[PDB]
Design a binder for this molecule. Sequence first.
Ligand SMILES: Cc1ncc(C[n+]2csc(CCOP(=O)(O)OP(=O)(O)O)c2C)c(N)n1
Ligand SMILES: Cc1ncc(C[n+]2csc(CCOP(=O)(O)OP(=O)(O)O)c2C)c(N)n1
Ligand SMILES: Cc1ncc(C[n+]2csc(CCOP(=O)(O)OP(=O)(O)O)c2C)c(N)n1
Ligand SMILES: Cc1ncc(C[n+]2csc(CCOP(=O)(O)OP(=O)(O)O)c2C)c(N)n1
Ligand SMILES: [Cl-]
Ligand SMILES: [Cl-]
Ligand SMILES: [Cl-]
Ligand SMILES: [Mg+2]
Ligand SMILES: [Mg+2]
Ligand SMILES: [Mg+2]
Lengths: 529, 537, 529, 141
Amino acid sequence: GSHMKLAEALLRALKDRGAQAMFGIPGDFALPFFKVAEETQILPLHTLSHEPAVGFAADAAARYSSTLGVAAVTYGAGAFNMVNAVAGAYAEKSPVVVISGAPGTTELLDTQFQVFKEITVAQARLDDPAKAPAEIARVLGAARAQSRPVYLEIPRNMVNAEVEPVGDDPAWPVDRDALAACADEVLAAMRSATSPVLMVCVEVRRYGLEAKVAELAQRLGVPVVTTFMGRGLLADAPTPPLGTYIGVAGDAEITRLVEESDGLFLLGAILSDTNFAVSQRKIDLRKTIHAFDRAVTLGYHTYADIPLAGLVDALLERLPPSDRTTRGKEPHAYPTGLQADGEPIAPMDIARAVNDRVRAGQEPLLIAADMGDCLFTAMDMIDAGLMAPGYYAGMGFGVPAGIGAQCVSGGKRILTVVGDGAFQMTGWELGNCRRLGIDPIVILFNNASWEMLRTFQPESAFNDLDDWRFADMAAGMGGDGVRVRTRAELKAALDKAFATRGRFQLIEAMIPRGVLSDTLARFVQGQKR
Amino acid sequence: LVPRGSHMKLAEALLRALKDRGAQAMFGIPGDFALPFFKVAEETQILPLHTLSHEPAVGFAADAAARYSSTLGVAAVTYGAGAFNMVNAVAGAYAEKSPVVVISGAPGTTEGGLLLDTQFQVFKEITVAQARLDDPAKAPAEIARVLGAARAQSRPVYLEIPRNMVNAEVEPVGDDPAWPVDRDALAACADEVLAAMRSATSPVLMVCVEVRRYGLEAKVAELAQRLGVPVVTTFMGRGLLADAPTPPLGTYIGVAGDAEITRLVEESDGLFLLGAILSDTNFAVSQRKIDLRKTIHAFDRAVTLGYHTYADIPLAGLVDALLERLPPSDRTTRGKEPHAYPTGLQADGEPIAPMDIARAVNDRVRAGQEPLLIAADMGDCLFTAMDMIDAGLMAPGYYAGMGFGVPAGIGAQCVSGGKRILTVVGDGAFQMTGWELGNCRRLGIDPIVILFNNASWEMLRTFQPESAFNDLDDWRFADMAAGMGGDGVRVRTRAELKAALDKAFATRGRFQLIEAMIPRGVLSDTLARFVQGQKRL
Amino acid sequence: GSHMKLAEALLRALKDRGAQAMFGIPGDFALPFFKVAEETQILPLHTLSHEPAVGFAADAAARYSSTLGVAAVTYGAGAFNMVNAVAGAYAEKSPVVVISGAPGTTELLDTQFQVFKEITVAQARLDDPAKAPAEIARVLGAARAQSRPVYLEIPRNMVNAEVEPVGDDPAWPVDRDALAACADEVLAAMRSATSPVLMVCVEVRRYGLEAKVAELAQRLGVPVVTTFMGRGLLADAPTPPLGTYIGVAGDAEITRLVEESDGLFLLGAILSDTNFAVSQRKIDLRKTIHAFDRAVTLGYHTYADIPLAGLVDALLERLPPSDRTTRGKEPHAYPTGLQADGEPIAPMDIARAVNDRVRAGQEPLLIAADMGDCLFTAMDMIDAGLMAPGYYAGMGFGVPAGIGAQCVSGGKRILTVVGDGAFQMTGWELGNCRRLGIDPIVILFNNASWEMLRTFQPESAFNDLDDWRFADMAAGMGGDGVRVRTRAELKAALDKAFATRGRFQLIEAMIPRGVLSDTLARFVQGQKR
Amino acid sequence: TRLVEESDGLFLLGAILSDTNFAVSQRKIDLRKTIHAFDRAVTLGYHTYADIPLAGLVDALLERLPPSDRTTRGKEPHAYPTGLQADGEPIAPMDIARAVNDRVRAGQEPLLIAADMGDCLFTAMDMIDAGLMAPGYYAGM
Ligand SMILES: Cc1ncc(C[n+]2csc(CCOP(=O)(O)OP(=O)(O)O)c2C)c(N)n1
Ligand SMILES: Cc1ncc(C[n+]2csc(CCOP(=O)(O)OP(=O)(O)O)c2C)c(N)n1
Ligand SMILES: Cc1ncc(C[n+]2csc(CCOP(=O)(O)OP(=O)(O)O)c2C)c(N)n1
Ligand SMILES: Cc1ncc(C[n+]2csc(CCOP(=O)(O)OP(=O)(O)O)c2C)c(N)n1
Ligand SMILES: [Cl-]
Ligand SMILES: [Cl-]
Ligand SMILES: [Cl-]
Ligand SMILES: [Mg+2]
Ligand SMILES: [Mg+2]
Ligand SMILES: [Mg+2]
């Protein structure tokens, strides 16, 4: 018989589901909601400067803990200013709960609702106190079940409406007969394949199925490969991945193994023609088994309403235990050996600088990367996780994602890599580190250029950018910046950054135009063909 | 048949069609799918190509350029993230009747799934017309149709160009197709409007946004003199008819404005809204504050009054029809300035308040400086700008979205032929898009920017002062200007403000950033009236 | 460069797609649209008395010619009063285009739009002249592709807006590889089955695939059976159906053949637990092949975007020609031999009366039946088609459907059978026959009872209805009515009705309570078990 | 009509607001000067009070007003048509109203009237009744 303000019921429902913080920027229509969030302290409230960062930070927080992210905005400009970040979270299967303030029920372009419907899997306007609890459960349940963003619009006069507490997600029971048929066909297909391959992908991480999938991989007995967004999965498994598939720029043997498989089990994979993703045009659709978005497709036919977790358990029930292991193999060889001299800096030198510290005893940091050669370089860095817009490829994610991740990392420092073009977009969010109580290390790749674009159209003058003095601007926003031009300066700056806590550390690495990471070089050489 | 032989690339035809319609530049940020299009733009130089740092600024700059010259604005982006990142700026342009032509690159017609097309569906919600130029034979007519729609309704439009179509040969783009015009309804409407104006006890003519967008100032000045009723402007009509025989008594902006003007408008029993946006946000004329039953609303090519709506009535046509029915008049209602601008800055050791910034600017003008056009962001900077003498004011007065300020000043100055722009912006808004100033050197511009730094989202504090989240940190913006190629100075006293403003005006060639420290709780007079007016109700 | 009023463009688009008439009831918001319809004469405009009849008549017209039906109503009460008829058309795969007038774009509960979205497959509010042509093509195209109702809302101020003519339906090209895979699996399943059965169902008729399916049936070589809504299909085919499956009340051999099949090919079937339909709980889901709603499901997996027509052509390409025929068999035995004496009337006597006339030389008439024992009786009548709510089971369809069908029959007379309860609902629509220029024969089964309900709960008094003198009321609404109590009177009345053209003929047959048709008797006996 | 539409203090105590048929329309009155008490809320002066039952608002107003013996009764405001001319002329809707009213004036206790939508409703407005039930706002037949 208890009841609470609608806003409080929502905040508690989010916390009940694992949310760790709420990022946001208020406005008139959202002020009452922000007041409840601040006064109740149910979720830590972190504000940022610009809405893109609110969305990227919530996305990063969701990815960091494989839970719900929370992004709060105000009606109109505020919400429209987060459309790109939300689209990116949708694209990369990250459940960001977008909460927008809205005009009261009694109160220029609804357009906003229509736009958000295009980039979320469920929406609700909480304008009826009696049904709000069920609607919140339905919408948050969809976010969790599909691992994609959702939209909640709260009229300002409803924030304080009394409602009953939010219950559990509505349960959608799987058809046992269909699941059995699905598991049987999938297993039969893997057994009939001359070259079966198990790809561990994004949904495995999002749904927290790492342990179950490590077990499945051991029992299935086929080669394991990860997709870009599955990087690091099963690293501690009995049969760790042979490597990561990233398309033309990756290991040739891995690329062929994936593309020539006649039993390619895409366990939770996002398919697209984007650079690093598994593309339908490069694989055998007559033999691929795509388990994704609560469905399983093979031989052009689909089993509906098959959650990934259920499929994995069904396969385990049909497989005998195994003690097989492949861990006696040699570990991956990362680029190391930075020559700390007076020579200029190349992207690979940044990778070597980071890797050398790790080899010398530094526990690796999780890396947040923006889109650009910084990402191609980060791929060769030893990390405690990599968070980047590898498929969506939108710029601006980097710095805000590092900030969002460190806000929920419980003390673990984050390393962010970002190019000059991307920094001009959202790097300024670092001015918020002092209030947030964080101190990320940021390596800014400054080549005074939109280099990825120059690489593919070198004759154009518009890719030449001005020389912005980012390191000189760091103090103005509360951080310690240093511009480095030589490998010796780079080595020294990285050590100093790790030795200095309390303020964000910005290392502005000057890189000449035309100098690329090894992976980007291979990508370019690959396209030419 | 597939076109062949025109020796004109689709992209070139589009750039030329835009130039034919008055476009003065193209702002944009490239990406893979848009590279071929940007190559044509750069190589042909049909329109000056200006790049910016972040897409919001591309949209705001294009919007500002459109507003500055009452023409088409052009914003070029790449498919996906690039385009989605400009949705807010485009929605703002739609909201304030500014024709921004959005041109997005797209996958080639024979190419090919991360979302769910999603992009087209989103843009269709914030534009008046759209076209995917994937058929060279139909491209010319589609361009004319879409650009024609932008000009007919003064709203943004969307053009999506598959990258393999950029260089496809096409025939030249013709003129805009004609929109419906009901001559019979026009005549009947004109008669009814005049009858309503004549019978009203307190009629009022409001000169609004469409009058400026459609270049009707001269015709409306003539109409105002002949109609013989009190004249007032809306926020977006501010400045119109200033030199006319019957100039506006003032600008209506709701409770925040002059009490006499507000009363005149809200008590009118014959309110003729000539081209007005009707909305309940910020400074817009609100359907909830006036009596729609006694209102004549001419907008979006229609006219509503007496419980009925006349369709297919272009504003220019209605004005001409009214003039044909009114005899000439020598009526003159000019007099000494209606709105008294604050002057007399006390250049001493006291802290700075928003009104001191208005006095500093106004004193320079009164001393002989030709006023600059002002670009303002949303915040107390806008409320303060209402009391500044200007050569035009560009701001999100209705949409109220932050981030517009600095990019708008940049876009306007790119097309101003050297006329310097004065930008006013708060600390919260500068944190969003003020960084775009780093592009001034390459763009060859040097705007003056007054940053109101109260370490606060102050407008929100006025609405909910109990909240701690409106307190912002100390950002040393002036100290960051050099890294962006400009001159910055932080000022704390009125004397420092006076000196810095003079130095900024005396120094061209580099943008000038004056970071004015202002205490929390100190508001412009207009924002103070706005806040008090809210409480009263 | 030509353009026309939006309303005219819609009417022509409907006529282009085969629509033969428009049924409707106007109101303030729809008056301008009705004016265009009346003045242009593009489609004959037929008004009725009450909206249920408008919907049932449009549904019947659609069914009669396997084309689009058109039902025009006014905003509010008018449209809400047609929700049941539209739901029934949706339930039975009939493409009724609902056109509602609406407030002008510049102008108590939108609720109406939301309600119609629940019972239609596509909707559009034509409030933008520039996009109206494409929206009309999209919505009408959905009606044709899915064979279900659609909704078009036209603001009154848009009726006369100038628009470009409507083009063709947007084309949704089928994936050739998926179709090939589907056809291969289906054919392999039919060949591996020990008892394959081809069921010809509603979509075969709706999409005009009778000739193609007759060919498929001959080449496939398996037994053919029809569903209730497939009654009469392939009657003239090389291998006509062995019979019609209608559940427990049908032929035992047919019921078992269907239910025990391990290769049940449901070609275009509506599945449901309703009386006469094929139910998922009575068949083997591990062996059923369900081709319906543009998909094909077997073994719990589904091939998407497979139009029925495409599937049939794909199977024909994989089957060799055949000269096989089963037409040497004995035809169906219908009840005949009415004893025209002084004894009371039973439902089977009505069937015998109708069948005897046919055996004596009368070309059979298409029969429109309402829900009740009249339908169970009609199942044993020789017809030129049977139109009834066999699956939806909603009352009131009968008389209006007969009226709608005769409006588009090009001179062919229609026979309607209806119970007293159903007649009290919509039988009054017969008052419109004079204006419509039609003269259907209507046999009203009057047992002063909701007999189907008494059969299952005989102890209830509320199923006892009063004695309404329907025949006595016929003249008041322009028809010739006669009440008959004996078999001799029945025989004479039916002959007189057929001999009298110009006015509807109402034969009110008095039937005692407790006297049922043979099929209903079997149904009841079946449920008991 | 003039009294209502020109009012600068229109207190709508429990009114349905709609533009259909006989309903009070937001387009005919000045909402700025209207006090709308309906659906357990009260709207006026550009703001809305929530959770206000109509019975509660009435009681609260009574508590703030002193008793009064004010009386504004007078001879019937609406003149009902009477005097049916019972002759050979055809029937018009007003004749039906006169027939009904004449019976009442002659001593018949009025009956409650149920009316459908159509001129029957417009005619019933001029009939003496013991209540009138009709779809006056919804206008459904
Ligand atoms: C929001 C957004 N706008 C534009 C692009 C197109 N784009 C892809 S790479 C690139 C250049 C990035 O420059 P930078 O951040 O300096 O890294 P670099 O290419 O020099 O390594 C651009 C503009 C994008 N991906 N996202
Ligand atoms: C894109 C966007 N996000 C949020 C808001 C809500 N908002 C309106 S005023 C304001 C504070 C502005 O702070 P500032 O720029 O420092 O100017 P001040 O109010 O202090 O004068 C905010 C966040 C908005 N209008 N637009
Ligand atoms: C619209 C609707 N309302 C109620 C029912 C429930 N119902 C099914 S059969 C029946 C009785 C029909 O009586 P009648 O038309 O006289 O035919 P009978 O049963 O006597 O053969 C009823 C009320 C229905 N199917 N449809
Ligand atoms: C269910 C429904 N359908 C259609 C209408 C539209 N309508 C309003 S008045 C009218 C005509 C009513 O005719 P009638 O009952 O004979 O009364 P009359 O207008 O002749 O006085 C119609 C069809 C409606 N209000 N309700
Ligand atoms: Cl993946
Ligand atoms: Cl305006
Ligand atoms: Cl069927
Ligand atoms: Mg760069
Ligand atoms: Mg501020
Ligand atoms: Mg009966």
